[PDB]
Amino acid sequence: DSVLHTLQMYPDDQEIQCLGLSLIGYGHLLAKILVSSLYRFKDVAEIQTKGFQTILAISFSKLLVHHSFDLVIFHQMSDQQFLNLCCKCFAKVAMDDYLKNVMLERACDQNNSIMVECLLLLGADANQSSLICQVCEKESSPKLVELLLNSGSREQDVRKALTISIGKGDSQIISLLLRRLALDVANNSICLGGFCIGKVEPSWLGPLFPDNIASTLARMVIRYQMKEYITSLDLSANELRDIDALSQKCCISVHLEHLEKLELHQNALTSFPQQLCETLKSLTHLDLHSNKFTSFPSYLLKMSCIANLDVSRNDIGPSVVLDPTVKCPTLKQFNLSYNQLSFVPENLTDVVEKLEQLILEGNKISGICSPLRLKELKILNLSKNHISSLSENFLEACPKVESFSARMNFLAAMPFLPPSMTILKLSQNKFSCIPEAILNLPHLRSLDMSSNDIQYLPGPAHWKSLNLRELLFSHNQISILDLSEKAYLWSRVEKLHLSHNKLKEIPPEIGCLENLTSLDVSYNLELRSFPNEMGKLSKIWDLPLDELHLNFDFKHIGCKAKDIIRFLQQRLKKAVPYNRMKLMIVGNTGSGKTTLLQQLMKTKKSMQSATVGIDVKDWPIQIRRDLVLNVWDFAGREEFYSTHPHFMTQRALYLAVYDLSKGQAEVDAMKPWLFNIKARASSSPVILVGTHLDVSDEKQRKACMSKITKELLNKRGFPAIRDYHFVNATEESDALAKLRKTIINESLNFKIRDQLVVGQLIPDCYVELEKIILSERKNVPIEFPVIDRKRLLQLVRENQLQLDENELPHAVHFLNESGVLLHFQDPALQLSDLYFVEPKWLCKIMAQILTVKKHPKGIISRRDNYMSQYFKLLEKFQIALVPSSLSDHRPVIELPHCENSEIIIRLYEMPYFPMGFWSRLINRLLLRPNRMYWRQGIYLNWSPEAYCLVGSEVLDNHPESFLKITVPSCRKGCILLGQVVDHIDSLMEEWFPGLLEIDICGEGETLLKKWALYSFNDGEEHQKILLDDLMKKAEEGDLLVNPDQPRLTIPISQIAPDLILADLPRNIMLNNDELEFEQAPEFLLGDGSFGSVYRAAYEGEEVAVKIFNKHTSLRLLRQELVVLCHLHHPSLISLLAAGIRPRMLVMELASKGSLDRLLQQDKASLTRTLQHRIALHVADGLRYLHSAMIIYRDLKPHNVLLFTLYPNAAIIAKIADYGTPGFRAPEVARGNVIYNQQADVYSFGLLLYDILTTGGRIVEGLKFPGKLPDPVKEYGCAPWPMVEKLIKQCLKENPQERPTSAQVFDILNSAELVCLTRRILLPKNVIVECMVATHNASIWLGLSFLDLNTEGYTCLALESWIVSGTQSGTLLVINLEKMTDSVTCLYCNSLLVGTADGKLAIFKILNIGNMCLSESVMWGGCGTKIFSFSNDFTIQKLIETRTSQLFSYAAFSDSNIITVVVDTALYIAKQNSPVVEVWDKKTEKLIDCVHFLREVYSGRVKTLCLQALWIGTGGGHILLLDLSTRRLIRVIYNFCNSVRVMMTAQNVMLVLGYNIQSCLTVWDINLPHEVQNLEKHIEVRKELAEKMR
Amino acid sequence: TPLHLAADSGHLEIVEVLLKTGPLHLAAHVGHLEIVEVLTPLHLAALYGHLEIVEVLLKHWGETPFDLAIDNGNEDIAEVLQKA
Ligand SMILES: Nc1nc2c(ncn2[C@@H]2O[C@H](COP(=O)(O)OP(=O)(O)O)[C@@H](O)[C@H]2O)c(=O)[nH]1
């Protein structure tokens, strides 16, 4: 410390400083003196060697860096021994990543180029405000910014730097940032859309258009440490209030003559500059909409060539008269949608002639139409206008119109339609009758006349057209469907819509339209009769059946459209009326149900010993119809009261049986049973039956048992009771006979919805199946009365039944509804393949544990082959804990919070508790919580701030039963309350529809009151004011609820969070002031293709808002909201806001639209480096979805949104699934099984198939049923291996084989996948030594021929001629002297031929050696001796590669020279030498390939070529390298298994390999970039996918 | 190991010293008879064309060594390989 103290106390002494530095090497503040000494004499004297040695001798480095030694090092860097010492010191100091990052930060602020580049080469990543913002705020040199951009940095950081630099006045840095952000040289486009650039000037756009010491220092440090003009310009989302800065004569106005596409949409322009339009003489795709225009320029058409003009949201004035002096014929499309026009353009006929599409939808053109003398017009649009009458000559001069459309117009007639007419869109008009002109059309295919009022719809006779493709006639008033005249004339119709029509019956000629693929007859409310001729229409795949109470026994899943056509066809074959009804008897214990049935049975062969289960048995009726009905002697004891609601059907007739031995009180015991009958079967009738007269006097019968029945039991909450009796159910009597007669009469006259359900007609196949089933009921073993599926198929095949596997689901469902057998179609049980015949045994053995008998009561464990399935049914019929016998007495419970200020309480008052309500509930509500259950409550809790107590609590002087839900007021409590509320409401709606049934007759009691409690005085108020839920929901306009006095108020969210959107993990509400939204046709996205999704502005940005209807359900919105709170991913659309006043849903807006519209409209924008990005993002989204167990339904090119058309963006595609075909997996469409992620993988493979094709198999628009064709074979797509292979792996018929979505993304993530054009396989046992190119392009392989575009199989060199030399010599040329040795080398230069013994031939016979050409002058070598040459034919150099024997072994060093590559430093390869030798061009003086392979396998180089150096090893691996630090980029493990020759070609790289089999691979030259460009593209996404967490 | 480098260099004294202190492919590639005697290899010898080394080794994808003899063009080595 003495030396340090002396040095510190004596400064400004170089001589003393030298001695101090010398003695330093032979301490937090100790480094301060050294830093001060270095800074003082940084360049005064060259005495830094001692300091460097001391630093090398010396946690010290971190303190030195903190001691600002970086400034001294930079000053020194800004003498071979000193340079080497400095490099070693820098390498030693920068070993730690933190020190390197600190040095980079401390060097970026100052303006330098060498130190920053050296540190970047050494590492020092620029993602640690971030770096670029700092370097852009200080106004640094352009070199620094460019160097930082070339390195790895975040896109959002560059965007922030763009905003910062735009804030300042600069051009170089701004242009560099724009080029990094928006420049697609491969596609010849500039994607400047999404950025909010204030303005555009030629200074920025100039450099955008097309027109070493640091590396050496970095290499030394590393060594020391180891020891076509552009076209498209998109300027859309920038708030370009004015663009006149580009109308000058700057350096780009000459370059602005090759645009062909200018995009200025979603801007605020006013008028296109005339100078810009006249200097833009090669622009044919200009669009400009969503701008604040006020009049058509009238000079925009004066350019040389223009097409696809688009001004579709501007506010153009009433007059748009085009200038007559302009005669532009180049215009094709002229969009003027959604403007403020009122007359059509007045010079459309003269200014433009070859106009194709004229769209004017949404305008306000009021006046009558002009003659419209356009000769080439193809498509005309006039929808959403205000038009009164068409001039008679409106379409008298347009003989090519195809799709004239006029929707939502006040038209009355149609003028002369040109004969070439093909499509009409006249919906939403006011047409009394179909005009004569429309009927006289000869080529009509798509006429839509919906929303009109047409009384008369003519039949096929009065339609001159024969090619009717589509017909839309929904929402009309049509009563007749005349078809009997000529049913075969409309045989070509596919779509025929007749919804919302006053139709009575479908005539018996609808079966002659065999091509009809969609017939819609819905909401007619009067059909009730589908004719049996609808069986020859097997081409119908959809058929809406709503508000049609058809007699067909509908099924939940066993009812598809094609299934309905099959059933109708079977009925057409042979129809028989059906006579079967269910007579299920209900009652209480001791009421005599069984004895009454037995006396009704007329059976004397039989103490009933109570009744377990349901005890089904059949009964035939001998009126002279058969009328076989099955009775279900329901149990009475109050333990089998949870299985009963499952066996209660609407299509049945009940009973209700008294016990008059008591009288006046048992009549009061049917309120449970009768209310349950009303709840489950609203429309069914009930027949009350007294059952004790022989032991009951006339008093009790004359008691209110006969009067209260007519006073209180008849109405007020009970079903339509038809008749009641007082039979004595012990012997046959007059009362019993009358009961039998009235039972029969009620059965004959059920009339469900006025349909007479007791005698409906069905195909004979169902009756035959029923007969077979009861025939087989006997021969089954008694222990298991059940037959399996295989036995059923054997029985169905054995007999004459003509039902295939498609009929069996519907047939077995109908036979189930009939009651002979029970079949469970739910594909979640382990019972779906087992068909339950003999339901009586099933019920009896099911109810076995209820009548049989440390822990609380009701909790049991597994105790006494089929048993593993036997429990599965028990938990499905609410038998298993056992909810029966579950401690009806409520256990003692202390609520953690009872302060009347933090508990949300909900009441659910109902007249009674429907059977098995609690059993279905506590089996549905279920960090594992702690909970204890009882008969009518659960109280499941996790924490003192997270609990839920739902139970039954009664009130004094209140006969009803009340359901109480208590939760804490916290967010977790709110979520718990919400979840319980949806569970209870869904159970009530699904299982007991009679509860939620607002009866029209009487009053709107709704039979179900859901009270919500609230207390004004927080704590000790002891009086919560009741409030009905619907009344509060009517108060949806405000958030606060307050009494008649406005002094006090309380938020709704605190008392009813299930109503206001506050029962979700995230607070999702929008301040209506920020939102700027209004419903309009203009703001509809994609013209209603997405449904009810409009365009709006939120928080200043643009968003897409989904608008719900006014159904006030608030159940689908919350269901859609709960899922969107758990999905955070860059490739998944993200939730922004969710309101309640309009009940909307705010989502991000993808500016480029959906994928389907893109590939159907912009086919030139789907470059090969964009389809891979789209597929990668979609695969990422599917992987994330399936990771969290969520399963997507179906992926289509419509369900994928594109956010930007820039290949190097962070996000390019996202998924979407809005609410409210051919892309179907062959696992569910053909058969029935639960949807799995394998179907999603199949749909994704379909999407890949459509993406790979330019337009896909969707342009055709026809029927689309592993039979898919080879895309390259007919779709014209370029080949793409490992993508076609991926499709074929994604389209296999076995779902278990198909890769998981987790692995499909991995397969889609490969730099080889993008950059690999063709992989040609040669004929077997063909060996090729040398190959040459010819450029269509072709390959000459040693002289076999190969075609690049045909794969036409049929030393070497390449003046359309070839030269080859045999192994024995004899040089030959095909459009010479035979040398003494074989010609080993050949090259085309102005030709050189090698020799085996050593000799060169120039076409000179000079011999050098005792054979491998190159270029860049020239180079090459013979044997082990490399040389160099030029046109002088002299050896300008001669270097012996054998001299490098000190490093490599003699095996590799002493071999010959196989090849050499020279750009600035020669690289020479030797035979079986895994270490390519690098030789300089001046100093005449190790790339160990085997080391690189070990880092990733012969490893012996066989051929190599430069552009990134590609080294082809003998093991079949292409090592990729770069000309900086010799760092390994990739080890391409091609399937060649070896490499013979690799070479560049026209930019691609051909590779020949031996696998015998010869493989010719064609890599892309861009491959070395795509190894890195993609690798940093995933991480910038991965971090994002982690930022959302 | 210095033995591999000594065998590659063909130094008889160095190889003997290393062996006595307490690589066949390298010796075959160098084609030194003394190194081979002191110390696959057959394929390497056939490719290089050292008849003595191949004979000594015979006395003492990776296909058979005779396969490369035809490609290398060594007629004598090919005949020797075919004989055995
Ligand atoms: N004496 C007499 N007994 C009756 C009459 N009706 C029913 N019972 C008795 O009711 C019992 C049958 O009850 P049951 O209907 O099987 O009970 P459930 O199956 O649970 O509904 C028998 O033991 C009969 O003795 C009647 O009219 N007279």
Author numbering:
A (entry chain A): 587 to 612, 624 to 655, 661 to 680, 688 to 737, 742 to 824, 834 to 849, 982 to 1360, 1364 to 1381, ...
B (entry chain B): 51 to 72, 85 to 101, 117 to 137, 147 to 170
From the paper:
LRRK2 is a large, 2527-residue multidomain protein. Its N-terminal half is composed of armadillo (ARM), ankyrin (ANK), and leucine-rich (LRR) repeat domains, while its C-terminal half contains two catalytic domains, a guanosine triphosphatase (GTPase) (Ras of complex or ROC) and a Ser/Thr kinase, as well as two architectural domains, a C-terminal of ROC (COR) between the GTPase and the kinase and a WD40 domain at the end. We present cryo-EM structures of LRRK2RCKW, WT, and carrying the PD-linked mutations G2019S and I2020T, bound to the LRRK2-specific type I inhibitor MLi-2 or the broad-spectrum type II inhibitor GZD-824.
We also present structures of full-length LRRK2 bound to these inhibitors to understand how the presence of the N-terminal repeats in LRRK2 affects inhibitor-induced conformational changes in the context of the full-length protein. As expected, the type I inhibitor MLi-2 led to a more closed kinase conformation in LRRK2 than the type II GZD-824 (left); the ROC domain in the MLi-2 structure is shifted toward the kinase by 3.4 Å as measured by the distance between the M1335 residues. Our analysis of the conformational differences between LRRK2 and LRRK2RCKW bound to MLi-2 and GZD-824 suggested that the constraints imposed by the N-terminal repeats had a bigger effect on type I inhibitors.
